[PDB]
Design a protein around this ligand. Structure first.
Ligand code: TGL
Ligand code: HEA
Ligand code: PEK
Ligand code: PGV
Ligand code: DMU
Ligand code: CUA
Ligand code: CU
Ligand code: MG
Ligand code: NA
Ligand code: ZN
Lengths: 49, 79, 84, 46, 58, 227, 259, 144, 514, 43, 98, 105, 73
């Protein structure tokens, strides 16, 4: 006699994971959060003086 | 005579991080010297070393406060 | 130390009462004599407005804010010197 | 003497799950809200 | 003076359901009601004082 | 200064900060060893169906687990304390400088010969010049000669502050009525940044420290022009 | 019915009123220091005395009148009282630490010496020596009171106890007088700070210990104590020796060595 | 058969690997057929059938070792729901960024960052390992 | 009925219940304060506009978590409920004084809240150093309300310590020696001895602060010859013992949890565990100046305190090891409480190792007053003390209430929290090595990335705390009543059923001398 | 530990509601203060 | 220097404190102040556990210096055994206060 | 301590007690599975015979499941024990948990 | 049909623990080698290489020309 996990486990796993990834990826990349990563290898320095 | 001063040298009487009393002793030394000289007729310039040392080590606001208290007669150290 | 006396066989009420009237109270009478003899007023010392004394970083919560709680006019100066 | 047993040895009632939910909400909710209201009070005082 | 401890033992051991703080009689209650009123009034007053002190009195 | 996504210490600027880097590496290797060992032992205790739930004997195994940590502690303490005493060693400085904390800015006094003193405030963000560092720059930097032993004396005129410059391995609290000494030696010229490190009120986050380290000749000309 | 020997206490309002009385006293002291007003303070002192009076009355009811202090219960009270004295020692220890800290390294603002420039210390051979003899003599008479009680002698106990209380009051009067006559005050820097806070807290403890002895006095007038069961009196004697010892340390540290 | 809360002082049944023989039988009240079965267990066990041997097992014990030790799918629900609530948290962060946080300081503008990086290279920030050590001062580019 | 039972209590269980309710509500207040700290820091710039308000929030976060959440729940809550049930005692020695320990805490909490309401609050840090705490930098009533708050909490704990020590030494079965009492009881006894010794020194110090502020004393004021550094000695003389007081009852609970869910009948090395706790208790009184390695003390003093502090690892690792050895050969039951305990054992070790790094006065010069200190102590408090509290709460909840939790929900709760705390505090090591100060409302731009991440982590732990509320509701909503408990022959507190009756051991237990 | 079945079972639906109301009791009041922080700042 | 007037416990002790004093004087321990002495604990010589109801909790220290005590309810009826060392205990109900 | 052979003998003797009751049967097995070992067939043999004296078929099967359980991942222990016990199983009519279908979840 | 040989039946938990505690150690020792090669030794060498031909006047001169100093234009 199959329990809650036997009937719903796989569906909870797959869609919890899918949801979590999508909403974190969106938040981290689309809403203007300034992460301020290392300039090394990424920024071209410009004259400041 | 024996000057050529850069800054106050190490003083084995005050070997730790807390130098509060190094400022204080030199300030008293100088003024005790200056009393003895100026009174008993002599040269203040023997007192000079103490003066150099305390100028180096003592915050300006401390020296300045203590000067005023000497003028005022409320300086608590024994001169 | 063992003192200069003796009894140590019975430490009963009797011994302790003996000590009360024979040693304890007489010492008190003697220190009282020594006292009501060295008493009588010291000529109060001159006022010097030293900055480490007569501290007022906030006024006291009674009187005029400037007098300590057992202020004695004869021996305690205000920050501005003795009172009249 | 006092009542004994599950749901009886606590100063709040668990007779009705929904009144209990309301009680819990107020109780924890007022704890968690309070510092936000203290910050507001401090911004508004000047 | 006289030793009246046995009479108080009998009073305080009377099986009348009263808790110890009310068992000596009518004065216990008055003493109890007074304490409790000054405590609760005092606390309400101190919350009032707090409310007063929480805003500037410019 | 710190740079973005930094994991570990600022590059050492003074020999003492360099000693601390190597001592930190030695200590962290131990830490990694111990915590990984503990994690490994846990996963090991939890991955078998074999059981043994009757009484076990404690006194034998307890030696390993007392003697070992004890040898390891000694291995950290020896070098720790060697560095401690080195930070204290008779040094003979060439220059003494005083710094006084205030709410919220530092003032500096160079009074070996003349009476040079001045105030050092954070530059507000709206006044920064392009390429200048938000919250770090001051209006008047602490100019010092490179490659010399300098005695800093630290105190305060109001509450506690703390004078720190991570790159040089320096942090000394500023306590009113007290003069704390530390010694500063830079191996390189340049600009070295620090920040008040004892909570002092509203603007604790905003009274930074900038050292400017240059050749002696330049230090002398600078000092004369600051009177 | 129980078959252990310990005491299940009847539900009591005194915890709550002593806790609220603590609220009113600390609030009231804040009103007093900052909003110049003594009202809340006065109310808190009042509910606090009422709570102590009713609480300790009930403990006497439970023990002298209802018989709940079995030897197991009595052992507990012994431990409670020793532990409480220990906490009071550490409390005073913070004040002796403050005194030694300040006096073993006097700072420049004092004149760099101890006693500071400008302070004129009391002479330790005068009234302070007399106070010392007062409290020591009262440690002897209170031991006489304890032995008299153990031997069943009602009259001598009351007499010894009365002497002890009088010596205590006398110390308190000498000390008030000394406070009034002292040429330095609590505002006179760290010297007056450590002096008056350390001796002041000790003076408060002498008044609490005298009050405790007076409560024992009346209970003994009423025959509450037996020659064997008298914990209220023993607790009061230990607390009175404690106050005597703290005085000896103050006298050697602050009056004598620090003059 | 039916366990009661008020029997906390009496021995009870447990299924545990390390306590294989519990203090009481799982079934203590016997039907007529179950009594005749227990009579039969007093004779030779070769006489019992497989079905009767099972039934005897099930009067004495509730779960077999295989049953009590079975693994479940609970881990999926746990990890799944945990990821759900973790994704739910990202919503609160989105809300926070959109309605509570104002603009960040002008020192994160791209041009400010490019100038500040040059100035940090000029002053040789972390020239031994951390930062300028990664810049090539001759070729004027980041070390590849 | 209600007033007699709940305001006039003399019953160790109901008083323990009140403490649990009190601490859980203080938990909510401390959590919202921590979220405000992380909101101010979760992007560059200023959010509050008011840096005095930031310092007020940081100070209150700390007092609320230590004095009103951790110590009421562990000592007042678990200690009241469990200690008499573990030694077969009919109540505490002083059951009416005990109720005053409890009732002193709401008025104490009220004073702390009042201090943030009046003037500009107490923005001092939880150490409340002068002169910042003095009557010029902090004029007005806030710091004085704070000091009085601490007085009432110190009196509540000192009377509680006297209760627990007397009970534990005096009310055991006449045949049971101290070496036959469970580890949790030892942990509470030893904690009570630290509280009894160290709280009066705290009280003496804040009293001297109060008089400097209001009676023209100058204990701490260089103008009258006083010394701000004397305050730090008095405060840390209490404050080191205070950290060990926060962790030791959690050590006692962890031993019971790991033993229980390993199916063992006793912890490994019972006398080594008792030895280690006494040793930590003893050493925790002689190490306090490691909180003062930058104030300018002599080099020898600093070498001694580095050395004394490192010794503490030895008895501590004995416990860590004995927990593991208890697991060894267990029949492991993967219950939610056991998951909290395993997380305790690992994370507490990480936090203890960073404490060893900080114990070197050399290296501490550069880490002091940085976020590396904040990382260290949140590892041992928010992942040691708090994980022990959650473990103890899920394990003993059916004893206290008579109802079971949904274990699946409880495991989800653990998973979310575990992710949240690690994401919040782990990056703080980078911030402190790289030189970011503690107690800052804003930071130079380079520190942005770690701060951003750390603030996001903090919202994940929020999600967990809300869920925990829901979990408790679901359990009282559903009313699954307890039937059977395993391992009662070595866990006496479960032997009276769930919940036990009001009076338990009216007839005491029978134990032969032999 | 073993337990009886729920005396007042809480269905999936009832859990949705208790979870939701719990979450909102924490989120709405804080959200309101935070949302308006800016009106309190210059004001 | 000598007279009386202080009551004795014998004269004045009351309630539970009196009950304990009088029972102690007859060598009885109705309030469980002393540790009971073990018998051989065999089936024919069980530990007799007095009680005022029909069950009492026994803690067995199976071997000297165990740190762990084995706890179990003893019910009225036949002797029961410690689950760990097997020694025997038998409940003897009743009486205590008359 | 005691040697392997001594320990084994002690447990054989324990279960061989002719008037062993059900309490002592339970106590012995539940104590034995506390050790870091799978018991020797001769111990198991004595324990199965004690079950036959107590007329308890069900405990005899439980004892076989516990032996398999104690072996943990060492799959070769249980088939060797069943081999050594096969004559006693045949003689007393004891079915194995696998023969009863009790090994399948 | 052939009899099975008698397998090891005692101390199986103790034997598993003996085997793996060695492994626990080894990892550590061979890791130790790793922290101390990839990090610590690398650090000593970074510093020593940098300072071996370092010229602080030349470094100063490049900074001065970049316009960084207040005291030295
Ligand atoms: C959340 C953000 C993380 C960002 C990661 C780094 C980015 C790489 C850049 C890209 C890499 C580029 C290479 C440049 C190297 C710079 C060298 C240096 O200067 O730096 C010195 C550094 C460098 O040390 C490191 O070299 C990084 C340490 C990472 C530790 C591994 C655990 C990672 C776990 C998960 C993180 C969060 C969640 C839970 C954490 C769990 C708690 C441990 O700074 C530290 O001191 C931090 C350590 C704090 C003390 C922690 C004590 C024990 C921790 C855990 C024990 C686990 C053992 C078993 C093994 C445990 C396996 C699980
Ligand atoms: C529960 C609270 C808690 C606990 C238990 C501890 C435990 C320790 N703490 Fe912590 N600490 C705090 C809470 C706590 N701390 C707090 C709140 C602060 C900040 C106060 C403030 O400023 O606001 C602080 C600050 C602090 C400082 C001040 C740093 C500074 O301000 O610059 C120091 C320095 O010595 C220190 C060290 C230690 C040490 C050495 C231990 C040790 O007791 C740890 C021992 C544990 C282990 C070592 C791991 C287990 C052992 C093994 C697996 C065995 C083998 C190990 C080795 C051989 C190394 N702590
Ligand atoms: C006769 C000796 C008996 C002493 C007691 C009786 C006197 C009045 C009340 C005080 C008792 C309370 C505690 C003592 C603390 C403060 C110091 C009091 C010692 C004292 O009485 O000092 C007086 C100062 O008094 C002052 O300010 C007094 C101001 C009164 C303010 C009360 C202080 C409020 C502080 C309460 C702190 C409470 C916290 C305790 C914590 C409890 C532990 C948890 C000395 O007088 P002066 O004029 O400065 O010098 C003499 C010059 N001729
Ligand atoms: C203006 C003056 C007031 C200022 C504020 C405080 C002042 C008042 C304090 C005076 C202390 C009085 C305490 C009286 C206690 C009376 C009750 C009592 O003494 O109870 C006794 C038990 O002891 C017990 O609980 C022992 C209970 C002991 C408590 C002792 C506590 C000292 C209190 C210190 C208070 C504050 C400390 C200050 C810190 C700032 C009863 O047992 P027995 O004596 O064996 O009787 C039984 C026999 O008769 C049977 O045959
Ligand atoms: C650290 C813990 C904080 C965690 C994050 C909090 C998560 C937020 C949940 C939202 O709560 C609210 O949402 C609003 C809208 O987004 C607000 O409405 C405001 O916004 C409106 C439109 O944008 C108007 O409808 C209204 O008047 C209103 O005041 C506001 O009241 C508030 O209750
Ligand atoms: Cu100045 Cu912080
Ligand atoms: Cu510490
Ligand atoms: Mg600091
Ligand atoms: Na900010
Ligand atoms: Zn036994």
């Amino acid at each position: 006699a199959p329990d809650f996990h036997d009937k719903y486990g796989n569906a909870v796993l797959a869609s919890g994971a899918t949801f979590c990834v999508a909403v974190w990826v969106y938040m981290a990349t689309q809403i203007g959060i300034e992460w301020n990563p290392s300039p090394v290898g990424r920024v071209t320095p410009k004259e400041w003086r | 005579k024996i000057k050529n001063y850069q800054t106050a040298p190490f003083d084995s009487r005050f070997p730790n991080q807390n130098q509060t009393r190094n400022c204080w002793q030199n300030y008293l030394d100088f003024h005790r010297c200056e009393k003895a000289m100026t009174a008993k007729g002599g040269d203040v310039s023997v007192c000079e070393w103490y003066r150099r040392v305390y100028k180096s080590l003592c915050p300006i606001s401390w020296v300045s406060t203590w000067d005023d208290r000497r003028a005022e007669g409320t300086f608590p150290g024994k001169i | 130390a063992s003192a200069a006396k003796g009894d140590h066989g019975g430490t009963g009420a009797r011994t302790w009462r003996f000590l009360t009237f024979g040693l304890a109270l007489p010492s008190v009478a003697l220190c009282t004599l020594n006292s009501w003899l060295h008493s009588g007023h010291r000529e109060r010392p001159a006022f010097i407005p030293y900055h480490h004394l007569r501290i007022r970083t906030k006024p006291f919560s009674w009187g005029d804010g400037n007098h300590t709680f057992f202020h004695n006019p004869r021996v305690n100066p205000l920050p501005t010197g003795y009172e009249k | 003497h006092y009542e004994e047993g599950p749901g009886k040895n606590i100063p709040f009632s668990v007779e009705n799950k929904w009144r209990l939910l309301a009680m819990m909400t107020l109780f924890f909710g007022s704890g968690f809200a309070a510092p936000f209201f203290i910050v507001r009070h401090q911004l508004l005082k000047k | 003076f006289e030793n009246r401890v046995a009479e108080k033992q009998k009073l305080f051991q009377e099986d009348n359901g009263l808790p110890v703080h009310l068992k000596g009689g009518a004065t216990d209650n008055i003493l109890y009601r007074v304490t409790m009123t000054l405590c609760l009034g005092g606390t309400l007053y101190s919350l009032y004082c707090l409310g007063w002190a929480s805003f500037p009195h410019k | 200064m710190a740079y973005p996504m930094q994991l570990g210490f600022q590059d050492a600027t003074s020999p003492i900060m360099e000693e601390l880097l190597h001592f930190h590496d030695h200590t962290l290797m131990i830490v990694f060893l111990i915590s990984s060992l503990v994690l490994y032992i846990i996963s090991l205790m939890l991955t078998t169906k074999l059981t043994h739930t009757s009484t076990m004997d404690a006194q034998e195994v307890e030696t390993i687990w007392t003697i070992l940590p004890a040898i390891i502690l000694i291995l950290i303490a020896l070098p720790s304390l060697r560095i401690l005493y080195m930070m204290d060693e008779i040094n003979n400085p060439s220059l003494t400088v005083k710094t006084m904390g205030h709410q919220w800015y530092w003032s500096y006094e160079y009074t070996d010969y003349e009476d040079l003193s001045f105030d050092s405030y954070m530059i507000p963000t709206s006044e920064l010049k392009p390429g200048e560092l938000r919250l770090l720059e001051v209006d008047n930097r602490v100019v010092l000669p490179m490659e010399m032993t300098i005695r800093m004396l630290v105190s305060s005129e109001d509450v506690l502050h703390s004078w720190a410059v991570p790159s040089l391995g320096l942090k000394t609290d500023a306590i009113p009525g007290r003069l704390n000494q530390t010694t500063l030696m830079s191996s390189r010229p340049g600009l070295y940044y620090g920040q008040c490190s004892e909570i002092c009120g509203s603007n604790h986050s905003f009274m930074p420290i900038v050292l400017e380290l240059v050749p002696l000749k330049y230090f002398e000309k600078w000092s004369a022009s600051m009177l | 019915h129980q078959t252990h020997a310990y005491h299940m206490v009847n539900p009591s309002p005194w915890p709550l009123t002593g806790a609220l009385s603590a609220l009113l006293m600390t609030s009231g002291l804040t009103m007093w220091f900052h909003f110049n007003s003594m009202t809340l303070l006065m109310i808190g002192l009042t509910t606090n005395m009422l709570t102590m009076y009713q609480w300790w009355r009930d403990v006497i009811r439970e023990s002298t009148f209802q018989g709940h202090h079995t030897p197991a219960v009595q052992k507990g009270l012994r431990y409670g009282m020793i532990l409480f004295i220990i906490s009071e020692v550490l409390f005073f220890t913070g004040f002796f630490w403050a005194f030694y800290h300040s006096s073993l390294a006097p700072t420049p603002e004092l004149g760099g010496c101890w006693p500071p420039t400008g302070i004129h210390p009391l002479n330790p051979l005068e009234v302070p020596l007399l106070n010392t003899s007062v409290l020591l003599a009262s440690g002897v008479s209170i031991t006489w009171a304890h032995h008299s009680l153990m031997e069943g002698d009602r009259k001598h106990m009351l007499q010894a106890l009365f002497i002890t209380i009088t010596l205590g009051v006398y110390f308190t009067l000498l000390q008030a007088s000394e406070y009034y006559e002292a040429p330095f005050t609590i505002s006179d820097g760290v010297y007056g700070s450590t002096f008056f806070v350390a001796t002041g807290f000790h003076g408060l403890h002498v008044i609490i210990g005298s009050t405790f002895l007076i409560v024992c006095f009346f209970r003994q007038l009423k025959f509450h104590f037996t020659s064997n069961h008298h914990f209220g009196f023993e607790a009061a004697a230990w607390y009175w020796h404690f106050v005597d010892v703290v005085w000896l340390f103050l006298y050697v540290s602050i009056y004598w060595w620090g003059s | 058969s039916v366990v009661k809360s008020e029997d906390y002082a009496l021995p009870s049944y447990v299924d545990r690997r390390d306590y294989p023989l519990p203090d009481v039988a799982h079934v203590k009240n016997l039907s007529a057929s179950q009594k005749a079965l227990k009579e039969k267990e007093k004779a030779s066990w070769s006489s019992l059938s497989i079905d009767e041997k099972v039934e005897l097992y099930r009067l004495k014990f509730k779960e077999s070792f295989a049953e009590m030790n079975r693994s479940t799918n609970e881990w999926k629900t746990v990890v799944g729901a945990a990821m759900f609530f973790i994704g739910f948290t990202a919503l609160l962060l989105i809300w926070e960024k959109h309605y509570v946080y104002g603009p960040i300081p002008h020192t994160f503008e791209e041009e400010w960052v490019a100038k500040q990086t040059k100035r940090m290279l000029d002053m040789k920030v972390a020239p031994i390992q951390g930062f300028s050590a990664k810049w090539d001062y001759d070729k004027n580019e980041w070390k590849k | 009925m209600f007033i007699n039972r709940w305001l006039f209590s003399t019953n160790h269980k109901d008083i323990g219940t009140l403490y649990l309710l009190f601490g859980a509500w203080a938990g909510m207040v401390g959590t919202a304060l921590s979220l405000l700290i992380r909101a101010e820091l979760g992007q560059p710039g200023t959010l509050l506009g008011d840096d005095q308000i930031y310092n007020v929030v940081v100070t209150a976060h700390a007092f609320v978590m230590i004095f009103f959440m951790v110590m009421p729940i562990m000592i007042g809550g678990f200690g009241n409920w469990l200690v008499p049930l573990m030694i077969g005692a009919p109540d505490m020695a002083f059951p009416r004084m005990n109720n005053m320990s409890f009732w002193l805490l709401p008025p104490s909490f009220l004073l702390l809240l009042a201090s943030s309401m009046v003037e500009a609050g107490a923005g001092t840090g939880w150490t409340v150093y002068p002169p910042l705490a003095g009557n010029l930098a902090h004029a007005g009533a806030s710091v004085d309300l704070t000091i009085f708050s601490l007085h009432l909490a110190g009196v509540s704990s000192i009377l509680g310590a006297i209760n627990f020590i007397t009970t534990i030494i005096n009310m055991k079965p006449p045949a049971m020696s101290q070496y036959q009492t469970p580890l949790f009881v030892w942990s509470v006894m030893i904690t009570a001895v630290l509280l009894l010794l160290s709280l009066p020194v705290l009280a003496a110090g804040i009293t001297m602060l109060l008089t400097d502020r209001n009676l023209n004393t100058t204990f701490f004021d260089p103008a009258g010859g006083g010394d701000p550094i004397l305050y730090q000695h008095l405060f840390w003389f209490f404050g080191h013992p205070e950290v060990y007081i926060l962790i030791l009852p959690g050590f006692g609970m962890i031993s019971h949890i790991v033993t229980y869910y390993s199916g063992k009948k006793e912890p490994f090395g019972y006398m080594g565990m008792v030895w280690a706790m006494m040793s930590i208790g003893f050493l925790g009184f002689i190490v306090w100046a490691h909180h003062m390695f930058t104030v300018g003390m002599d080099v020898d003093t600093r070498a001694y305190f580095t050395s004394a502090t490192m010794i503490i690892a030895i008895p501590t690792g004995v416990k860590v090891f004995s927990w593991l050895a208890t697991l060894h050969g267990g029949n492991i039951k993967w219950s939610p409480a056991m998951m909290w305990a395993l997380g305790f054992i690992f994370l507490f070790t990480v936090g203890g190792l960073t404490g060893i790094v900080l114990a070197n006065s050399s290296l501490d010069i550069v880490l002091h007053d940085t976020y590396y200190v904040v990382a260290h102590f949140h590892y041992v408090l928010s992942m040691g003390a708090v994980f022990a509290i959650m473990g103890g709460f899920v394990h003993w909840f059916p004893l206290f209430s008579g109802y079971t939790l949904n274990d699946t929900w409880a495991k989800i709760h653990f998973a979310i929290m575990f992710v949240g705390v690690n994401m919040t505090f782990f990056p703080q090591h980078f911030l402190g090595l790289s030189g970011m100060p503690r107690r800052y409302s804003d930071y130079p731009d380079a520190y942005t990335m770690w701060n951003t991440i750390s603030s996001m982590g903090s919202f994940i732990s929020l999600t967990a705390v809300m869920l925990m509320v829901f979990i408790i509701w679901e359990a009282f909503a559903s009313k699954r009543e307890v039937l059977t408990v395993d391992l009662t022959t070595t866990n006496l507190e479960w032997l009276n059923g769930c919940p036990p009756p009001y009076h338990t051991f009216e007839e005491p237990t029978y134990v032969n001398l032999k | 530990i073993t337990a009886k079945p729920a005396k007042t079972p809480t269905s999936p639906k009832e859990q949705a509601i208790g979870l939701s109301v719990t979450f909102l009791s924490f989120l709405l009041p804080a959200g309101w203060v935070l949302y308006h922080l800016d009106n309190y700042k210059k004001s | 220097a000598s007279g009386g007037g202080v009551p004795t416990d014998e004269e004045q002790a009351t309630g539970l404190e009196r009950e304990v004093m009088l029972a102690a004087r007859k060598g009885q321990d109705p309030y469980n102040i002393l540790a009971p002495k073990a018998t051989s604990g065999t089936k024919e010589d069980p530990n007799l556990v007095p009680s005022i109801t029909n069950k009492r909790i026994v803690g067995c220290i199976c071997e000297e210096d165990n740190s762990t005590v084995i706890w179990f309810w003893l019910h009225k009826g036949e002797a029961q055994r410690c689950p760990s060392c097997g020694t025997h205990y038998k409940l003897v109900p009743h009486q205590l206060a008359h | 301590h005691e040697t392997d052979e001594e320990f084994d003998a002690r447990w054989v003797t324990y279960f061989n007690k002719p008037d062993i009751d059900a309490w002592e049967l339970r106590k012995g097995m539940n104590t034995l599975v506390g050790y870091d070992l799978v018991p020797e067939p001769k111990i198991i043999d004595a324990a199965l015979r004690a079950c036959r004296r107590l007329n308890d078929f069900a405990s005899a099967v439980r004892i076989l499941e516990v032996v398999k359980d104690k072996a943990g991942p060492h799959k070769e222990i249980y088939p060797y024990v069943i081999q050594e016990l096969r004559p006693t199983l045949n003689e007393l009519g004891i079915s194995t948990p696998e023969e009863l279908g009790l090994d399948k979840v | 049909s052939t009899a099975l040989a008698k397998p090891q039946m005692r101390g199986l938990l103790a034997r598993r623990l003996r085997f793996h505690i060695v492994g626990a150690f080894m990892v550590s020792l061979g890791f130790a080698t790793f922290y101390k090669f990839a990090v610590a030794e690398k650090r000593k060498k970074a510093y020593a290489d940098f300072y071996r031909n370092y010229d602080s006047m030349k470094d100063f001169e490049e900074m001065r020309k970049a316009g960084i100093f207040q005291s030295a234009k």
